[PDB]
Design an enzyme around this catalytic site. Structure first.
Site, mmCIF file in Angstrom:
data_model
loop_
_atom_site.group_PDB
_atom_site.id
_atom_site.type_symbol
_atom_site.label_atom_id
_atom_site.label_comp_id
_atom_site.label_asym_id
_atom_site.label_seq_id
_atom_site.Cartn_x
_atom_site.Cartn_y
_atom_site.Cartn_z
ATOM 1 N N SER B 49 -51.767 193.457 48.199
ATOM 2 C CA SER B 49 -53.056 192.890 47.774
ATOM 3 C C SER B 49 -53.536 191.703 48.614
ATOM 4 O O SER B 49 -54.624 191.196 48.377
ATOM 5 C CB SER B 49 -53.065 192.559 46.277
ATOM 6 O OG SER B 49 -53.201 193.753 45.525
ATOM 7 N N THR B 188 -51.661 186.251 46.578
ATOM 8 C CA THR B 188 -50.360 186.894 46.483
ATOM 9 C C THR B 188 -50.459 188.373 46.881
ATOM 10 O O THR B 188 -51.554 188.973 46.870
ATOM 11 C CB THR B 188 -49.829 186.858 45.023
ATOM 12 O OG1 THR B 188 -50.769 187.519 44.164
ATOM 13 C CG2 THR B 188 -49.620 185.424 44.546
HETATM 14 CL CL LIG Z 1 -56.173 195.946 46.760
HETATM 15 CL CL LIG Z 2 -45.791 184.615 41.443
#
Ligand SMILES: [Cl-]
Ligand SMILES: [Cl-]
Ligand SMILES: [Cl-]
Ligand SMILES: [Cl-]
Ligand SMILES: [Cl-]
Lengths: 247, 246
Positions: B49, B188
């Site tokens: 991501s 993250t």
């Molecule tokens: Cl994504």
């Molecule tokens: Cl985390």
């Protein structure tokens, strides 16, 4: 927004502290605002440090502020506040409210260009008399809570008469709280404690993005005792908390 | 980013937790970077991501994301995570890491525009094979920690090959901590637990603006157990704390 309604129940938070002031809160999706005092919502006051919002944008527009990453160098001279005695970014100077940095910006912008931009922005009474570097501090410039919310809504939407990029740069500089589904942009103001028959004014203005909603706000109050200053945040936070926004 | 120097004293925070990973930290004013592991610093991994950063810029560039205030409407059908089962703003979708929102963005961007932009951004190996809506999740795209900091520096400076306004929009969407003289942008990532003999990767990347200094960072680690996930933030935080970065 569209409508404004007077909510007299919002006086409870003012009367508890013996404060004379106003809070205006607008919800974008419903195009509706509420206030404790309709009359005061439209009354105009010295912007004080809330002027940093338009001044920063005008500084960028005119190129007085060269770009987003310009550093304002402390020159070594003693300043009125201790937190201003250092090098500052644009965001830093806004956030610690370094007035002398912005007085110099205003001097460089000049009278002709400042006047034109305050017209474009429909900013208050648009009266810049009282000296180029202080009209918003002790001069003749006045703006209402309603006008602040209108200005802030335009800024949020990138609809001010200024480049979208300059509006964006100034918006990130205004972030005061960041959470995954909660974001606050805000700016304080304080003109001083005033004199016999003429109290000063305190401001808190900004907007809250919560989930897909946005709420614009403007608070001001009369002030003649500096120990009452934290109320400029506590009253609006309590009202916004009661509304389920949570300040 | 300038020069990079290996500093093996950072391995302390990794060995303590039996973590195989890398941290890359770059100080903008000194044009120098440090890492615990030079070899791993340059090794390329699935972005997971962390890809939401270039994907968001590309979505805006191509008009797929109509503007700053586009609302991503939930269709009311099950999503993998409960936090995703709601209407989201662009910032909300990035912050809760709503992958299905970004998969639909990628589909609408389409292969040609996506390929062109990853080349323009010099984004990892620039390999988009494996499906338009999954190449960064389970396909062939790989990027290193060094490349992440290079890309983030460019974003910070508004020097990516995209409009300054779109880079600015994605930057505000990335803010995760705001204080008067301290600002953090971060994202993250987590590819999953991998397969036998082949761990997944966890990421934390971003930058810290402290007074007039700026620090760019990229962390990654091998992961085969979801319980280890919080280390992706705690390890880098401990290192940045030891460095005096608030
Ligand atoms: Cl994504
Ligand atoms: Cl985390
Ligand atoms: Cl000022
Ligand atoms: Cl899903
Ligand atoms: Cl997938």
């Amino acid at each position: 927004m569209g409508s404004i309604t007077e909510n007299t129940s919002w006086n409870k938070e003012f009367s508890a502290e013996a404060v004379n002031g106003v809070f205006v809160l607008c919800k974008s999706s419903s195009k509706s605002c509420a206030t404790n005092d309709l009359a005061r919502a439209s009354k105009e006051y010295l912007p004080a440090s809330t002027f940093k919002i338009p001044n920063a944008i005008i500084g960028l527009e005119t190129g007085v502020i060269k770009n987003e990453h310009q550093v304002f160098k402390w020159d070594g001279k003693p300043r009125a506040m201790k937190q201003w005695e250092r090098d500052l970014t644009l965001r830093g100077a806004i956030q610690v409210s370094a007035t002398p940095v912005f007085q110099q910006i205003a001097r460089e912008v000049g009278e002709v260009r400042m006047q034109k931009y305050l017209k474009k922005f429909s900013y208050g009474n648009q009266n810049i008399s009282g000296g180029i570097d202080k009209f918003w501090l002790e001069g003749q410039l006045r703006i209402s809570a309603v006008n602040q919310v209108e200005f802030l809504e335009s800024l949020y939407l990138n609809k001010l008469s200024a480049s979208k990029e300059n509006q964006l740069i100034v918006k990130e500089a205004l972030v005061t709280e960041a959470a995954p589904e909660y974001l606050v942009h805000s700016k304080t103001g304080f003109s001083g404690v005033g004199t016999e028959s003429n109290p000063g004014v305190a401001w808190w203005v900004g907007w809250v993005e919560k989930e897909t909603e946005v709420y614009f706000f403007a608070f001001n109050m009369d002030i003649d005792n500096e120990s009452k200053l934290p109320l400029r945040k506590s009253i609006p936070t309590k009202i916004m908390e009661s509304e389920g926004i949570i300040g």
